[PDB]
Amino acid sequence: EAKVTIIYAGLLIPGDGEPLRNAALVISDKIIAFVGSEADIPKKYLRSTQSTHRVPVLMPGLWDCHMHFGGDDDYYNDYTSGLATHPASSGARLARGCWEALQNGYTSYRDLAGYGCEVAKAINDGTIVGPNVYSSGAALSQTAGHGDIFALPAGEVLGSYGVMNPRPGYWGAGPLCIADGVEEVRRAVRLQIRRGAKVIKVMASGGVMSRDDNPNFAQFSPEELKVIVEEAARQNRIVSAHVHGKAGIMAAIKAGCKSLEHVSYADEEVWELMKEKGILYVATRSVIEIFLASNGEGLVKESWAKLQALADSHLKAYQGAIKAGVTIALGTDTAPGGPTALELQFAVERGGMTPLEAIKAATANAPLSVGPQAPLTGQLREGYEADVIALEENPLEDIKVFQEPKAVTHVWKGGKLFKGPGIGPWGEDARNPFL
Amino acid sequence: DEAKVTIIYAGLLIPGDGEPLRNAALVISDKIIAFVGSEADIPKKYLRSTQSTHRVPVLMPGLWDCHMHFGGDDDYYNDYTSGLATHPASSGARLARGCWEALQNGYTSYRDLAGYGCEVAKAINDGTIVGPNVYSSGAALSQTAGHGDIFALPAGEVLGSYGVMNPRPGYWGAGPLCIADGVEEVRRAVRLQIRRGAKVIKVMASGGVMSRDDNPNFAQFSPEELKVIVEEAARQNRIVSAHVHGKAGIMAAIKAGCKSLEHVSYADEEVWELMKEKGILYVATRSVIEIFLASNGEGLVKESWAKLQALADSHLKAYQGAIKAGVTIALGTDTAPGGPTALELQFAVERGGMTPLEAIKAATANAPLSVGPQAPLTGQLREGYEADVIALEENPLEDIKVFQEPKAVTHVWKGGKLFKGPGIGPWGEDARNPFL
Amino acid sequence: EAKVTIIYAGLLIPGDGEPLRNAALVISDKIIAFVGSEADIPKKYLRSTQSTHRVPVLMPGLWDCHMHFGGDDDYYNDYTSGLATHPASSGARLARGCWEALQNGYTSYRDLAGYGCEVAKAINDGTIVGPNVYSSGAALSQTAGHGDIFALPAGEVLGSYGVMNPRPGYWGAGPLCIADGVEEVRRAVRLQIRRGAKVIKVMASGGVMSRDDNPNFAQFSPEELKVIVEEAARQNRIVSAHVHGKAGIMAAIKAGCKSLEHVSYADEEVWELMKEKGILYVATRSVIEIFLASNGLVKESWAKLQALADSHLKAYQGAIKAGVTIALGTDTAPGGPTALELQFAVERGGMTPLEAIKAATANAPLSVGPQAPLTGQLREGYEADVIALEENPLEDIKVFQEPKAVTHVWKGGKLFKGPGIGPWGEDARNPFL
Amino acid sequence: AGHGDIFALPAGEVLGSYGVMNPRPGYWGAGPLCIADGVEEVRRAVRLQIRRGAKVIKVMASGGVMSRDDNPNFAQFSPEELKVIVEEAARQNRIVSAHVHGKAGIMAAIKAGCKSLEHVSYADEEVWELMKEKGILYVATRSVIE
C-alpha cells in the first residue's frame, strides 16, 4: 500500500507560477500526487491518507547550485588545506554540514569541487542525512589555473591531482584535478564520472583575487574545452564553467558549456548568447559581498580598487542578465550548511528580482544546473519529486525569512519527513544504522 | 566570567570503583568533578553559586569501550578489501553518525584500534561534530602475511597502500592498517601513527580468529620487532595493545612489554599470573565470539566450524579464569562506533561471571588503563576527576541489559558539557551551526 | 599625502624625442607628474615638494632585455652548472648582481633563462634590492635543442627539466625546461606562468657554437611553436625566440613570436617581416664580441664563428638602416657588463648615441609586450624609473661604463642611489629585525 | 613525527622531500631538514650533510617548545640511532649538537656523545655536573623564550 500525506497550505508557492491561497498538496510515496485548492482534493486521498498537516506556507525544497564539499581543517587559509586535510576529517565535517542544510530547507545541492560523490554514498545508504547531492567530483584546472595551489611547488600539486602516474592512495579522487592537453583532459573528465559525478566543472578563467592568475584572462585552450564538453555530453552531463572576464565567458560558451558561474563581465552580447543557447547564469553574489564587507582590510590599495571595480561589473552583469531575461539559478559558493539563504536576499536586493522570481531561481530553475541528470523536481506539481518544505511566515513579504532555520518547520525529501514536529534529528523512523 | 557549577542529586550513585551511594549528590565545576558524597554534605558555596540543578534516579561515570575500529566502510566488499577500497571521505561521514550514536548511548570514551580515529577526532575537538573522547591507535601494525594483511589482494597493491617504504602523494602512512617487516620498518610504522596523533599503538601478534589464511595459534612479528615497537611507543608515553589468541602470541606480546591484550583466547593459569604481576590489561571482546556462535557455522565447512567452537570454549574459560584470578579487566566490543557495545556488559556478567557492579568497573574505572599514561583522571565519580557523567532512569545493578536501551540514558555530560538531556538539541547545549 | 620630488636637469633626455636643456621633472609617489622646462613647473609642486635635486643630466632608467639569472658555481664550464649548482647558492649570487645592476642605473631586466621569478620575490618584499625583473622562468627547448645538456645522459637531463613525472624537489622550476610534442609544450608554458613568468623564451635554432646542435637549423616543430605562442598569448605574454639561421628566424616569425634574439642571418626579407608584424630585434652583439676577442678552437670551427660574426654584424646594421624596432640586450649575468651593449649599438650597429639610448629605454618595454607598464620614458603618467648622470652620454656613449657617473637612481619613485643614501636605498631597515 | 617533521602536511610529501630513500632529481638530500628512521637510514642522513660540507651535525632529541604535536618533555630518536649519529659525525671530526628541552632528551643526548646542547630547558644539578664532566657546551637561546 502507498503512503499518502495531505498538506493543507494557507499559501502555496509552486516554484514557477502564481501562488495559491488555501491550497493542498498530496504526497504518494516519493512523488507529488496532487496540487490545487483544498476544496478539490480527490476523495480517494481523503480516505487513504496516513497523516495530515496544516501549515501557513508551502513551497518546493531549495537548491543551491554552487557548493563545495571541502570539509577542510582550519589550519591553512588557502587551497593548501584541500591537499593537507585528510578526507576522513573532511567527510565527518561534511556530515554536519549536510544535516544543517536539510534543517534549513535545502533538499538539493550542486557540489562543484570536493567529495560530494563520496559523501553521497553515506546519504544514499541511510547512514547520514542530507540534500540530494549532484557532484562534479574534482574541479578541472590547467597547470597555473584557478585550481592550482600556487604556494606549493608544482610536483607536489600534480603528484596529488594530476592524471598521470597512477598509484596507491585514492589517486584521481580529490577536490581538484590538473590536466594539460587534449589527451589528459579526456581522462580528467572520465575520472570524475568514475566517482559518480553528475556534472563537470572547469576553471575557464582566473580567480577573483588578481594575485597569481588573472580573472580577465581565459583558462584552458578552446581545444581542451571542446573535448571536455564532448566527454561530459557522451555520458549525459553538462559542463559548468568558472568565468569572470569576457575572454573566459566567450571561450566557455563557444565550447558548449551550459552553466556559467560568477559571470562578472557579462554584457549585452553575453546575455543574448546565453538566452539563445539555453545557458544557465549562476551569479554567486555572496562571494563578492563577503570581500566587500571586509573593506580591503589587508590588501594593497590598488588591489582593493581592482576588487571594487570587479564588484561593480559583477553587479551590472547580474542586473543586466535579470533584465534581459537570461535563465538564472542561485548559488552561494560556500561549504554545506553555509549561509546559502543570503543569496536569495542578494537576488532581490542586488539583482532586482521580485521575491517570487528569486524563489523561482532557487527552485524551479535550479535543476537546469545539472542538465539531463535532473529528475522532475524543484516544483510543486503533479508527477514531480516530493521535495517540499513548510514555512511559518510568507517569504514573499520578506525574503530574509529563509535566514532563520526555525522558520522552516517541515522538510520532506523524496516524500520522507526529515524535519517536523515530533521528528528526531535523523528523520522519521530513523534507526541506528550500526545496530 | 564565572566557573560553571552544576549540582546533580542522585537516588543512587555508582562511583565506578567502590560501593554505590544512596541519596547522593555530585557537583561539576567547569570540566572537573568538584564534589561527590551524600546530598546532606554538599558544600554551601556550591549551593549559592550553582547555575542549574538536576535530579535523577541513577548517576554513574561515562562508559568506555576499549576495542572499537573507526572503519566507516562501504558495504561492497565483505573482507578487509573494503578498508582499502572505501574512500576515507565516505568513511568519515559514516563515523560521524556512529560517534553521535555512541554519545547518545552514554559512551564518553572510545579506544580506536584500527582506522581513522585520529582524523575524526579533529572534527570532534573543533566542535564540527560530537562524540566520545577518542584515543586512537591510527593504523593497526601487522607483518606481511599477518592478521592485518588483505590476503585476497596481491601483495604489491597492499604494501603500496599500507607499507612504510615509497613515500608518495595520497595520504601515505594514514590508513587503517600499516604493514612493516623488520626492526627498521617497524620504527617508522610506530612513528607514523604518533604523527597522526595516536594515543595508543596496536599490533597484530597472532593470527586471525577465522584461521582461513593466518593461524590464531601462531605468533606474529618477531620478538625483536615487538620489543622495538614497545620501546618506540614508550618513548612518547604510549602503551601497546596486542591482538592475541594462541599462547605463543600471548607470551611473545607479554615478554616484549605490551600492557594490554585483546581476545586472549588461550590464556591459562600461567598467563593470568603474568598479567597480574606486570599490570597487563585483559580485554576479552566476547561479543565477537558470540556473533559467530549465533551463526551456527552456516557458510563454513564442518571442520572449520568445529575449530571455531573449540576456540569459543577456550575463550570462555580464559575469560572466566582471568576474572576468578583477579586479573584487571576492561570491556571492549570490537565493533564500529555506535555499534552494540552495551552487549559486552551483558556478556561480562552472563558469560564471564562478573557481578553487575564489577562489569561496570570494567567499563568505567578500569578502562583508562587501556591507554596507559595518556589517560587523564577519569572513569570515576570522584573529586578532581573529569566530568564525564551519565544519568539513567533505572538501576543497572538489578538488570545489566538496561544499557541496551539508549532512551534509558537520560543525561550525558562530557568534560562538564551537556550533550544529551531534557530540552537539549542533537548537537549538545548551546550548539551553533559551525558553518556560519 | 603624496610624496613630491623635483629634479632640475641641465640636460634632460626623455628616451623618445629631442632632449631639453634646463628642464625639470616632478615625481609624485610612484609616477612622473611633470616633465618640461624649469620655468613651467606647476606651482602646486613648488609648494608641496619634500625635496629638490639639481643634476647635469637626467634620463630614464636603463633596460637590458637579455639577461640570465643563473648564479652558477664556477665549477663546470658548460650548462652542467645550471643543473649542478644548488639554487640557494644561485640566489645569493644573484642578490649581489641585482645590487650592482641598480647601482649602474639599470632599473629593468628581462631574464630569459633562470631564477628571475624566484629572486623577484626577495626584491618585491624588500629583503634585497634590484631592477624590475620580467622573467621567462625556464627557457623552453626540445630534446637535443640548445637548452639540452648534451654532455650529460638524457635521463638525468629530462628527469631534472622535463614536464613528465611530477615529484618532490622543486619540479618545474629550473633554468631550463625540456618538452617534446604539442601536449608537453602546453604544460611547459604553463609551468613558467605558474612561477610568475612575464615572458616566454624558446630555443628556435641551434647554439652559436656548432658542436652539438647547429645554429643554421630550426628547433621545435612549427606545430609546437604555434601552441607555445597561443599559450603565452592567453595570459597576455609574448614569446621571445633564440634564433640564428634563417630557418629558425622564419619559423619563429610564422608562429607569432614578437621578439627575436641574436637574429644572426636576418636579411632584407626578415627586416620587412619584423617591421610589418611589430617584432622586436635584440641583437646581443656583446656575446659575439667576447668570442671574437678570444680568437682553443679548431681552425675550421673558428672560421665558422667568424663567418657567423660577419653575418650578425650585417644583419644588425641592416635592421637599423631598415628601421626595424630595436632594443638592447647583452646575454650576461645580473651586474654584468651591460653598458658595453650601448657602445656596440653605436660603434658596430651605426646608431646615434640618442638612438642607442632609445633602444635601451623607450623601446625596451616592448620586450615584454602587454606586461609592460607605461615606462622607459621621462613623460607625464609614466613610472618614475629615473637616473641622473654627471656627464652627457650623447657626447660619449662609454660614459655608462663607469657606475660612479650614475649619481642618482630612482625606481618606482624611490631613491636607491644618491648622495647620503646607503647601500640598500633610502629609509632602508634591517628586514630581519 | 619529530620536531623536524611538518605535521600539517601529509607524511608522503614530507618524506618525499626530506627522506633518505628514493634518490631522484631535484637537489635530493639538500634541504633544511632530513627525516631518517632507524640505524641504517641515520648513517646516510649524517653522510648527506657532510657531503654538502657540513661542519657540525644537528639532531632533534626532544619535542618542540610548543606542545601541539610533539612534546618537549619526551625524547626523540632511539639511543641506538643517536649513538650511530654521533659515531658518524666523529669519524669526520664533527661533533653533534642536540635540540633538547626535557630531561629525558637531555640525558639521552648526553649518553650518546653529543657535545653541544641547545635550549636545555629542564637542566638541573645532575645535568650541570654531567656537562662539566664531559665537556659539553650549553647554548641557552633565551631570546626564543623572551
Tab-separated table of C-alpha atoms in Angstrom, chain C residues 80-311:
chain	number	residue	atom	x	y	z
C	80	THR	CA	76.051	21.219	-16.419
C	81	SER	CA	76.486	24.030	-13.854
C	82	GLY	CA	72.861	25.106	-14.173
C	83	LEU	CA	71.891	21.627	-13.098
C	84	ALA	CA	74.614	21.040	-10.518
C	85	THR	CA	74.544	24.410	-8.710
C	86	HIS	CA	72.194	24.425	-5.740
C	87	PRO	CA	69.636	27.276	-6.251
C	88	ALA	CA	70.393	28.691	-2.762
C	89	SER	CA	73.958	29.317	-3.988
C	90	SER	CA	72.433	30.856	-7.147
C	91	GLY	CA	70.087	33.213	-5.332
C	92	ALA	CA	72.847	34.523	-3.082
C	93	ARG	CA	74.982	35.350	-6.127
C	94	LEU	CA	72.053	36.938	-7.978
C	95	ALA	CA	71.462	39.215	-4.983
C	96	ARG	CA	74.895	40.836	-5.473
C	97	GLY	CA	74.257	41.039	-9.224
C	98	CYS	CA	70.912	42.754	-8.735
C	99	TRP	CA	72.502	45.291	-6.381
C	100	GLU	CA	75.224	46.031	-8.916
C	101	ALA	CA	72.681	46.449	-11.722
C	102	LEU	CA	70.768	49.107	-9.812
C	103	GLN	CA	73.971	50.973	-8.890
C	104	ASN	CA	74.687	51.148	-12.643
C	105	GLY	CA	71.317	52.711	-13.482
C	106	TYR	CA	69.589	49.553	-14.702
C	107	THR	CA	66.065	49.641	-13.331
C	108	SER	CA	64.561	46.895	-15.511
C	109	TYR	CA	65.911	43.476	-16.602
C	110	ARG	CA	64.361	40.840	-18.872
C	111	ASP	CA	65.530	37.428	-17.614
C	112	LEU	CA	65.394	34.776	-20.377
C	113	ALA	CA	66.681	31.711	-18.503
C	114	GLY	CA	66.844	31.166	-14.746
C	115	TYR	CA	65.531	32.184	-11.363
C	116	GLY	CA	64.272	35.729	-12.049
C	117	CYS	CA	60.775	34.908	-10.779
C	118	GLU	CA	62.068	33.409	-7.562
C	119	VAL	CA	64.602	36.205	-6.915
C	120	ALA	CA	61.921	38.841	-7.705
C	121	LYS	CA	60.069	37.783	-4.568
C	122	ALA	CA	63.057	38.909	-2.483
C	123	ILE	CA	63.183	42.258	-4.306
C	124	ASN	CA	59.402	42.839	-4.023
C	125	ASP	CA	59.266	42.028	-0.286
C	126	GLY	CA	62.110	44.483	0.400
C	127	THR	CA	64.678	41.881	1.568
C	128	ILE	CA	67.104	42.784	-1.239
C	129	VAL	CA	67.243	45.430	-3.959
C	130	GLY	CA	67.272	45.279	-7.717
C	131	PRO	CA	65.756	46.118	-11.080
C	132	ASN	CA	62.220	45.316	-12.035
C	133	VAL	CA	62.623	41.724	-13.172
C	134	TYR	CA	60.494	40.372	-16.025
C	135	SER	CA	61.397	36.703	-16.148
C	136	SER	CA	60.723	33.895	-18.591
C	137	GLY	CA	61.316	31.312	-15.884
C	138	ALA	CA	62.902	28.390	-17.742
C	139	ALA	CA	63.911	28.642	-21.386
C	140	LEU	CA	61.901	26.090	-23.352
C	141	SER	CA	63.895	23.675	-25.506
C	142	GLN	CA	63.319	20.480	-27.423
C	143	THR	CA	65.271	17.318	-26.617
C	144	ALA	CA	68.567	17.817	-28.445
C	145	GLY	CA	67.857	21.562	-28.566
C	146	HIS	CA	70.017	24.486	-27.443
C	147	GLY	CA	68.710	24.082	-23.924
C	148	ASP	CA	69.755	20.414	-23.606
C	149	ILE	CA	72.957	19.463	-21.747
C	150	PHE	CA	74.490	17.176	-24.321
C	151	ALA	CA	77.385	16.123	-22.125
C	152	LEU	CA	75.035	14.505	-19.582
C	153	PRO	CA	72.933	11.466	-20.358
C	154	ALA	CA	69.369	12.128	-21.391
C	155	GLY	CA	67.556	10.585	-18.403
C	156	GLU	CA	69.400	12.869	-15.999
C	157	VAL	CA	68.505	15.983	-18.044
C	158	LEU	CA	64.817	15.139	-18.577
C	159	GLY	CA	64.460	13.916	-15.003
C	160	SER	CA	65.568	17.397	-13.936
C	161	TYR	CA	63.884	19.551	-16.559
C	162	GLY	CA	61.130	17.530	-18.263
C	163	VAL	CA	57.395	18.078	-17.793
C	164	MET	CA	56.539	14.444	-17.110
C	165	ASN	CA	56.919	12.649	-13.728
C	166	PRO	CA	55.989	15.186	-11.109
C	167	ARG	CA	57.951	14.641	-7.919
C	168	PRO	CA	59.309	16.396	-4.874
C	169	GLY	CA	62.320	18.688	-5.340
C	170	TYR	CA	61.032	21.934	-6.928
C	171	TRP	CA	59.926	20.135	-10.111
C	172	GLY	CA	59.193	22.503	-12.996
C	173	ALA	CA	61.245	25.364	-11.536
C	174	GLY	CA	64.738	25.364	-13.047
C	175	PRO	CA	66.590	27.438	-15.629
C	176	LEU	CA	65.609	25.107	-18.489
C	177	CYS	CA	62.521	23.181	-19.493
C	178	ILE	CA	62.585	20.292	-21.971
C	179	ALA	CA	59.363	19.447	-23.754
C	180	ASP	CA	58.610	17.401	-26.904
C	181	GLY	CA	55.259	17.499	-28.664
C	182	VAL	CA	52.176	19.715	-28.523
C	183	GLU	CA	50.893	18.114	-25.313
C	184	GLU	CA	54.112	18.609	-23.341
C	185	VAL	CA	54.719	22.100	-24.587
C	186	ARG	CA	51.381	23.326	-23.275
C	187	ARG	CA	52.481	22.309	-19.804
C	188	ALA	CA	55.974	23.765	-20.379
C	189	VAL	CA	54.500	27.240	-20.924
C	190	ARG	CA	52.023	26.899	-18.037
C	191	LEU	CA	54.779	25.873	-15.645
C	192	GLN	CA	56.619	29.181	-16.262
C	193	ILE	CA	53.453	31.256	-15.877
C	194	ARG	CA	52.925	29.359	-12.593
C	195	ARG	CA	56.227	30.805	-11.297
C	196	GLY	CA	55.131	34.312	-12.324
C	197	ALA	CA	56.869	34.490	-15.710
C	198	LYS	CA	56.115	37.736	-17.582
C	199	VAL	CA	57.559	36.492	-20.854
C	200	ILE	CA	58.155	33.116	-22.550
C	201	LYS	CA	61.506	32.165	-24.127
C	202	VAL	CA	62.039	29.386	-26.696
C	203	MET	CA	65.100	27.931	-28.374
C	204	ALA	CA	64.136	28.090	-32.060
C	205	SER	CA	67.502	27.282	-33.516
C	206	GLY	CA	70.860	25.789	-32.546
C	207	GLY	CA	73.529	27.400	-30.404
C	208	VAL	CA	76.089	29.851	-31.720
C	209	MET	CA	78.821	27.222	-31.258
C	210	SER	CA	78.258	24.498	-33.956
C	211	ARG	CA	79.392	21.449	-31.841
C	212	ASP	CA	76.192	19.581	-30.835
C	213	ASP	CA	73.213	21.399	-32.418
C	214	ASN	CA	73.548	23.635	-35.462
C	215	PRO	CA	72.654	27.362	-35.462
C	216	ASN	CA	71.570	27.110	-39.110
C	217	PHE	CA	68.833	24.567	-38.343
C	218	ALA	CA	65.461	25.375	-36.771
C	219	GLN	CA	64.299	23.887	-33.475
C	220	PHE	CA	60.839	22.773	-32.339
C	221	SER	CA	58.185	21.991	-34.934
C	222	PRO	CA	56.001	24.772	-36.340
C	223	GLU	CA	53.129	22.931	-34.587
C	224	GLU	CA	54.818	23.217	-31.167
C	225	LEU	CA	55.845	26.863	-31.710
C	226	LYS	CA	52.282	27.929	-32.583
C	227	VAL	CA	50.907	26.255	-29.421
C	228	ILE	CA	53.647	27.854	-27.315
C	229	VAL	CA	52.662	31.292	-28.710
C	230	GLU	CA	48.922	30.617	-28.160
C	231	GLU	CA	49.555	29.517	-24.566
C	232	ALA	CA	51.565	32.655	-23.783
C	233	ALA	CA	49.032	34.926	-25.533
C	234	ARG	CA	46.105	33.631	-23.473
C	235	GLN	CA	47.776	35.023	-20.350
C	236	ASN	CA	48.950	38.240	-22.119
C	237	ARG	CA	52.561	37.177	-22.631
C	238	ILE	CA	54.608	37.354	-25.786
C	239	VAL	CA	57.276	34.818	-26.827
C	240	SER	CA	60.912	35.628	-27.372
C	241	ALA	CA	62.832	33.327	-29.717
C	242	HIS	CA	66.547	32.482	-29.719
C	243	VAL	CA	67.354	32.439	-33.455
C	244	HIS	CA	70.454	32.432	-35.671
C	245	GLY	CA	69.831	30.854	-39.039
C	246	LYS	CA	67.058	31.983	-41.355
C	247	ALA	CA	65.152	28.671	-40.984
C	248	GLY	CA	64.788	29.392	-37.287
C	249	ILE	CA	64.041	33.074	-37.842
C	250	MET	CA	61.206	32.389	-40.296
C	251	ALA	CA	59.645	29.587	-38.221
C	252	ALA	CA	59.629	31.813	-35.149
C	253	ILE	CA	58.065	34.675	-37.101
C	254	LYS	CA	55.400	32.469	-38.674
C	255	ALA	CA	54.382	31.103	-35.270
C	256	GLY	CA	53.739	34.565	-33.787
C	257	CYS	CA	56.884	35.260	-31.712
C	258	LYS	CA	57.159	39.023	-31.068
C	259	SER	CA	60.781	39.261	-30.003
C	260	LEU	CA	63.848	37.713	-31.648
C	261	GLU	CA	67.291	37.298	-30.102
C	262	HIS	CA	70.645	37.355	-31.936
C	263	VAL	CA	68.904	37.166	-35.317
C	264	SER	CA	72.286	36.451	-36.965
C	265	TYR	CA	71.129	35.661	-40.518
C	266	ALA	CA	68.428	38.318	-40.803
C	267	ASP	CA	68.284	39.788	-44.298
C	268	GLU	CA	66.042	42.188	-46.251
C	269	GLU	CA	63.172	39.697	-46.208
C	270	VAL	CA	63.455	39.353	-42.416
C	271	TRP	CA	63.714	43.107	-41.718
C	272	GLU	CA	60.492	43.817	-43.679
C	273	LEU	CA	58.660	40.983	-41.915
C	274	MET	CA	59.707	42.256	-38.488
C	275	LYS	CA	58.557	45.782	-39.352
C	276	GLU	CA	55.255	44.565	-40.790
C	277	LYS	CA	54.349	42.484	-37.763
C	278	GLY	CA	55.888	44.637	-34.994
C	279	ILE	CA	58.592	42.197	-33.946
C	280	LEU	CA	61.409	43.378	-31.709
C	281	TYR	CA	65.078	42.891	-32.649
C	282	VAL	CA	67.502	42.206	-29.798
C	283	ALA	CA	70.947	41.682	-31.255
C	284	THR	CA	73.129	40.806	-28.208
C	285	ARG	CA	76.291	41.869	-30.011
C	286	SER	CA	78.306	41.576	-26.747
C	287	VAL	CA	78.142	37.802	-26.982
C	288	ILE	CA	79.785	37.821	-30.421
C	289	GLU	CA	82.399	40.402	-29.412
C	290	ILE	CA	83.507	38.220	-26.479
C	291	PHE	CA	84.390	35.201	-28.634
C	292	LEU	CA	85.910	37.477	-31.314
C	293	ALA	CA	88.259	38.878	-28.661
C	294	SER	CA	89.345	35.281	-27.852
C	295	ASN	CA	90.415	34.237	-31.340
C	296	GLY	CA	91.370	26.796	-28.198
C	297	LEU	CA	89.175	26.154	-31.237
C	298	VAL	CA	89.869	24.097	-34.341
C	299	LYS	CA	90.739	26.231	-37.397
C	300	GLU	CA	87.534	25.327	-39.333
C	301	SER	CA	85.331	25.988	-36.296
C	302	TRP	CA	86.962	29.387	-35.784
C	303	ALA	CA	86.317	30.299	-39.449
C	304	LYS	CA	82.681	29.296	-38.954
C	305	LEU	CA	82.422	31.567	-35.907
C	306	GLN	CA	83.902	34.480	-37.872
C	307	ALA	CA	81.503	33.864	-40.755
C	308	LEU	CA	78.625	33.970	-38.261
C	309	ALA	CA	80.086	37.105	-36.631
C	310	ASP	CA	80.128	38.939	-40.010
C	311	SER	CA	76.550	37.919	-40.861
